[PDB]
From a paper:
Polyomaviruses are small double-stranded DNA (dsDNA) viruses with a circular genome of approximately 5,000 bp. All glycan-binding polyomaviruses analyzed to date engage oligosaccharide (glycan) structures featuring terminal sialic acids that in mammals are usually presented either on gangliosides, which are molecules composed of a glycosphingolipid, i.e., a ceramide and an oligosaccharide, or on glycoproteins, which contain mostly complex and branched oligosaccharides attached to amino acids during co- and posttranslational modification steps.
All three proteins fold into the familiar VP1 pentamer structure. Superpositions of the VP1 pentamers of ShPyV, GhPyV, and FiPyV with that of HPyV12 confirm that the core VP1 structure is highly conserved (RMSD values of 0.65 Å, 0.83 Å, and 0.73 Å, respectively). In HPyV12 VP1, the BC2 loop comprising the Neu5Ac-binding site is formed by amino acids T69 to Q83 (T73 to E87 in TSPyV VP1), whereas the putative binding sites in ShPyV VP1, GhPyV VP1, and FiPyV VP1 include amino acid residues T61 to Q75, T57 to E71, and T58 to E72, respectively. We calculated all-atom RMSD values with PyMOL using the BC2 loop of HPyV12 VP1 as a reference.
Numbering used by the authors:
A (entry chain EEE), E (entry chain BBB): 22 to 291
B (entry chain DDD): 22 to 89, 93 to 291
C (entry chain AAA): 23 to 85, 92 to 291
D (entry chain CCC): 22 to 91, 94 to 291
The structure:
């Protein structure tokens, strides 16, 4: 960030690893939303709290570094690398748990399918969010938070980029995926990675391995610096929809994300 | 360009970064076109101004250089670029045509899409090519015309007579203008089109990705008149409305983060 | 959590082991029995013979303040019998209104293998917490025998070791990314109703099992742990229009070297 | 070719770049074929001249080389920047396409089976005969695989060396009966990709930042015999599906070439 | 593999290149099978000879090396590299040759589509085949060869891996693709490469170029050593099915494969 970055402290107990998971927040806590609803044209677009998928977020507490915050050089934890995994991909190989049945009702149940998003960020502070949504008029129930101008309104500009609509991902299960994307004009002290696929019946493609590592160092060899000795993890893994037999109703299906972050002590001015 | 390129000036205040965004121009300003129309066979192909998606374009003003013993020009070295609001499409409740015979959720944006951006030291060079030479574009849109005002059958293939400079936002339709590969020496452009009726869009986003703008000889776009030229075209697909079963083009904005350095040139 | 020393690097210091794991899709001859779907509000209690499981085996390897353990360095692995799917005459649901050939295997599929120095660590996660697995299958249970709603997401209480072939259902158990320090695992799932399988085969491909520090899986008790899950898709039978899981076998060729460790 | 290749001449005026385009030859000249026809079973397979897509080809004239009294020099094609022009033309759902969502939606963008292919060569591209239906009747002036006697037997559906030709005329050799001959083309570099299916979506990229090296395993590029550069193209993006008629038309796209050549010394 | 490999002989006439093609063997010789048939449930699965696609195979005769077979060091040809191409991909851009017509009969004919396999091997001996098939009970007409135990039977194990079912690809147009895969437990002296795609109407994707070369040398820099001065080529290129208009019957469509192999003389202990 806008800190002056100095030498990497090295030695034993200059590096630590944190293991964490984020369970999905698809509108309920057990990995499925309630049924997806669609207001009739000309009616209010006011979906149920429990059908709006949100970003998962957590701040992990790191070991205290500076006894005096007033020393003229500080130590901050620097996130160097992350091993991350989407847990329970194998759970989707299930054609018997009440899925809409293929081949005119004689086949097995539909495995999870439809539009999906997979996304994670590691950061030294809350992730910066830019407001952008499909329908400016959408009404999010409390306690969810959506793009608002200072006056409380939400005009047509919220369907494109208007800098007036910004927020910090500072609470789990609160910021809907559908009205908030990572702000590419900020997040200097965060690394984020996302992939969205659309379509009605699109098959999800997900891989898993313990052999994959992502470097979090930027073009200048600096990783996220954890302000207040706090590591900020964010997740969004909506694998697709579950299509229920007989009802033919659709439910968002979320998956949890494992994190394994490596950090090292780093010196900064002030 | 047709300038003689010399040494990279280095020192304090020899590099700068510019941040910009281009909002989409899909025919209106709030990211959706009006309904897509299709003339009956034998009728004029004359679509509405507000249903024709166009290239977004802007010229960013750079610091003045040769105010103050060699000639200097800004050289665009790299760009971090992002399509903003991809997450907006994970929305199955905002009036989309409903799946599984009307009992399921609304269709997320789908269909044919184009994603494209250019960084340049001058206006982007456009070659005329369109699906239907007879198409009638309402004013103020601009489409391929010969000098006499006509548009013959050759405009469906390559005819060098049909050329233009992308010199105005929301004006040049994506469907009749492509980047001219015979020119654009002083511009770097990147585009991907996918077709199909219900094709799912696939879009990624990260702040960890950089594109080098230097050519085979280590030279980036040189900003003539101290002006950086950005262009965008991000039509994510169509929105399919429930009940009407009408289709609307859906555009997305594009963030740019360009790094430039001072470069010396002879005339 | 061992202290790893020098690679012993002399005569009789390397060996290669060949093995195959046949699939465990619910029966032993590469097809499950018909996939069943309880009516809404009825118990989700599928047949033993319709639940695909992880294949697993422990290969026995050759038999002081410094010890020698076998270190798995590399693996050549292959999914055998991919060519078996080019078959449009063996009773498949027929295309083009019954006049065409039978459907080749299609639908949702998973391909997965692990090489390890100990049993593969499994985390419990399933689509439906209420699912009832017949004996002798094992599914996520708390210590008290219950299985609450948390088993649809990550709850650390639901863990197991892949210590028996044809026993742990693919659908309620994934590799635990919080453990498996001494195992290398690789998996790819594709969903969809009629999704075409895409599978490649060659004897020219090798996977390195060494980690970021050049250490491979260390075989505790002189035992190499292999695991497999290759559900190619479903077979769609003509007339019945019923679906059967189709499994494929996996060949392993592992190279190991002697490695020195403290204790 | 069967020349002995020597040193790369370097100096002033030892390299040049040529710009060219090939417009598509899908059966007419304005980027669409006439309607695709399908004979009834048992009837002759005799499609219209104007519904058979062909290879585009051109020979560009290079500067004359052996004229100075001071080794003999041929132009060597080193690299090519190539682009499919007018990909953006396909983002069009208003020009009479079969309409989606039961007639209330927009027109179908181009879709279906497609082929994208280009070659750079020092001589005409070598073609091997292979076709789906040996009995197909190509109208004059099109050329299809024939034995010396004029016949075309069942072997033309697989590889029979008897069926060979040189791509020596634009808009003449149908894509469907001629592929690049991998047993020849020593002095040509070719690159092709075909995708099938009824409604398959075309995926096409465009950029001015991409270069293809034309040098072989021995660092030799195509050597332009008679000071002539041979370009070939085949860009059938897919079909246009017309509303109401529900008839299909092949849609071709033009291909830009930017070739870099250098002088190269050869012995007889 | 199995020979003591010594120095690479170098000199004039120490390298040679062979050009060959394998025409497809989809059940007839002109690139199409007869109609695909499907026995009714409970009836014998006994398809026609001319509807079963098989591996193409050929042994190319190489120049004689050893005048005395009794010399204590021999020369064998070593296959170093291969340029290989699937010929006639462009043949599929054909919507007028009697294909089932799109858009309710008013459109053009279906181009070849459906499940496909592309595969080639270069070897110093016949390719090793492992028996595995979808239906153990399938009855292959003479002269085709399918997995049999020594006693003549074919039990349920032939649907998975049973080492008892092995064969050498020693005859063209004889070993069905559907019951035989390359044996990964053998083929030490062969290099093989295969890709299968399934589905009913799956579009084939095939590329062609004269600029692509595959190295055949193993992890120890040894290529296939041609026993008896014979190079073994194998091919399987079933591009998909042809769907005929009116009949709505399906025919396997095969394509030929070009080979260009480079070999060098190599010394071995004897
Ligand atoms: Cl609207
Ligand atoms: Cl079908
Ligand atoms: Cl469920
Ligand atoms: Cl895999
Ligand atoms: Cl069965
Ligand atoms: Cl016929
Ligand atoms: Cl290409
Ligand atoms: Cl290329
Ligand atoms: Cl037309
Ligand atoms: Cl030949
Ligand atoms: Cl035919
Ligand atoms: Cl291949
Ligand atoms: Cl036929």
């Amino acid at each position: 960030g806008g800190i002056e970055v100095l030498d990497v402290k090295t030695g034993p107990d200059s590096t630590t690893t944190i293991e964490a998971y984020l369970n999905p927040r698809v509108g309920q806590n057990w990995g499925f939303s309630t049924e997806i609803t669609v207001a009739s044209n000309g009616y209010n677009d006011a979906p149920h709290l429990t059908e709006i998928p949100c970003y998962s977020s957590a701040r992990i507490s790191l070991p205290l570094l500076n006894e005096d915050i007033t020393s003229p050089t500080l130590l901050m934890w620097e996130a160097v690398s992350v091993k991350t995994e989407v847990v329970g991909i194998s759970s989707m190989l299930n054609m018997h748990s009440y899925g809409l049945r293929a081949f005119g009702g004689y086949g097995g149940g539909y495995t999870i399918e439809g539009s999906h998003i997979h996304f994670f960020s590691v950061g030294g502070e809350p992730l910066d969010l830019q407001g952008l949504m499909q329908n400016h008029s959408t009404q999010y129930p409390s306690p969810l938070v959506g793009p608002k101008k200072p006056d409380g309104t939400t005009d047509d500009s919220a369907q494109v980029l208007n800098p007036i609509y910004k927020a910090k991902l500072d609470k789990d299960a609160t910021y809907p995926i559908e009205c908030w994307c990572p702000d590419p004009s900020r997040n200097e002290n965060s690394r984020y990675f996302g992939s969205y696929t659309g379509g009605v019946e699109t098959p999800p493609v997900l891989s898993f391995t313990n052999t994959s590592t992502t470097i979090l160092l930027d073009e200048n060899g600096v990783g996220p610096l954890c302000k207040g000795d706090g590591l900020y993890l964010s997740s969004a893994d909506v694998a697709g929809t579950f299509v229920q037999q007989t009802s033919q109703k659709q439910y968002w299906r979320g998956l949890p994300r494992y994190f394994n972050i490596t950090l090292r002590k780093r010196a900064v001015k002030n």
